[model samples]
Target: MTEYKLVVVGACGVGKSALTIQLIQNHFVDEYDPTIEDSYRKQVVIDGETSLLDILDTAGQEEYSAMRDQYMRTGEGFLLVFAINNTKSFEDIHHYREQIKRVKDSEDVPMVLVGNKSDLPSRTVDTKQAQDLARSYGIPFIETSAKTRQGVDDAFYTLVREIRKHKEK
Candidate 1:
């Protein structure tokens, strides 16, 4: 079994602590920190092997802007997320994408682009635009709904897979 260090930075990254809530079993887990950052762990099977995921969850915000550097620098991979309903949300995904790469001092860190609120009413941003950005960066673009629990597991697993590929190579 291996541990996957991951953090979701959506819309630069915000509005979906449910993204974290969707995967982790306990909201009442230990080591609490309100608003800024709280981390939890979950163990799951990955193609017959065990994997532990540690995710850092913070306060969901409108801008989903500038999270602390401490968490950003530590994780092996990150999820760059946005809700499709919010047009501004899509653009901010790039803001954090660049921020993370800059923090890592490389453009090669494992990361995924997420289009959240997939089950929501309407999408201001087209799916193709999201896909194109992911293609341009050569990262995976996953559309998810924290409410429906759709694509949630895949998003994390993709990051785990990404981290493994980034390291095992």
Candidate 2:
């Protein structure tokens, strides 16, 4: 089986674990650890091929920040997540992108720019801005809501496609 070493990286409260759990368990938790180092796996069939997604979540646990470099080294793809209502989290996306480069050797790594919390009524980071940012970064951008399960699967599935295409060269 093909394994996708995907990482959910971003600031706290952006719904990384929530997204993963929603996909794997079909449920959502209001609070998940403020959560961190959290690992998860799921078997899926994408485009008629069976695959496994191995996820490492960096969910605001300060301790794991130091350990991320090690994980980054092995990560095949990334979900650079941010909150739609929180601009700070949105800004932190830059940090993670640059941060990934610091630990991994590949410049054109496979990644998906995720804007979570789409269920929130208030929006701070405009969709166009995120779209432009993803466009500029040469990656796909998806908005998701773990609470509502909107675009959650697509976000993860598309990342798999990103990894598959990246290795084609």
Candidate 3:
């Protein structure tokens, strides 16, 4: 059994919790309570391999900036999420990437950039720009929709694959 810790982070209401819930429970929340002060953890097995995925679904507001650093410390890889239609959420990726680097002390920690919310058309952000940003950071990138289950497995498997490679001797 291999142990792994993965974190999903993005601006509030951008579907971080939704994606996490969908992955863990295969369900979505219609009414979300954003008052939660801390993060949550979950575990899963892929291909009979065991891994403990600790998800720190943080509040994207600036007040929780310190907590971001705290969560970054306990993970091997990070899934940086942003809604496809929200440019601000896309911009925040830079801040998150910098935070990850600052707290984790390495660029080698696999970071997967996820542009979520593919089901909405009017909310479409620049796909090329997002891909370019991920390329700039040298990380795996994918667009996903929790509602339609588009690329959901890609987002999860890509990070897991990277984490598994790191654990290889």
Candidates' C-alpha lDDT: 0.77, 0.88, 0.78
In each prediction, how many residue pairs overlap at the backbone (N, C-alpha, C within less than 3 A)?
4, 0, 1
- Provide the TM-score for each candidate, comma-separated: 0.85, 0.94, 0.87
Candidate 1: C-alpha lDDT: 0.77
Q: Report the lDDT of model 1 for residue 5.
A: 82
Instruction: Show where candidate 2 strays beyond 4 Å.
Output: 63-67
Pairs of residues at least 3 apart in sequence or in different chains that clash in candidate 1: 9-13, 10-13, 10-81, 11-81
Candidate 2, poorest ten consecutive residues by summed lDDT:
59-68
> Which candidate leads in TM-score?
2
lDDT string for model 1 (1-169, tens) is: 6888887775433445777877774242223233555677999897776988888764534332345565567788988888989988787877777778777888789998888889878879899999999999999999888777778889988888889888976
TM-score for candidate 3, residues paired by index:
0.87
For model 1, the superposed segments whose C-alpha errors exceed 4 Å read: 11-14, 26-36, 60-67
lDDT (tens digit, per residue) of candidate 2 on 1-169: 7888998888888898899899899998997877356678899998999988998876554544555668667888999999999999999999888878777777789999999999999999999999999999999999999999999999999999999998898
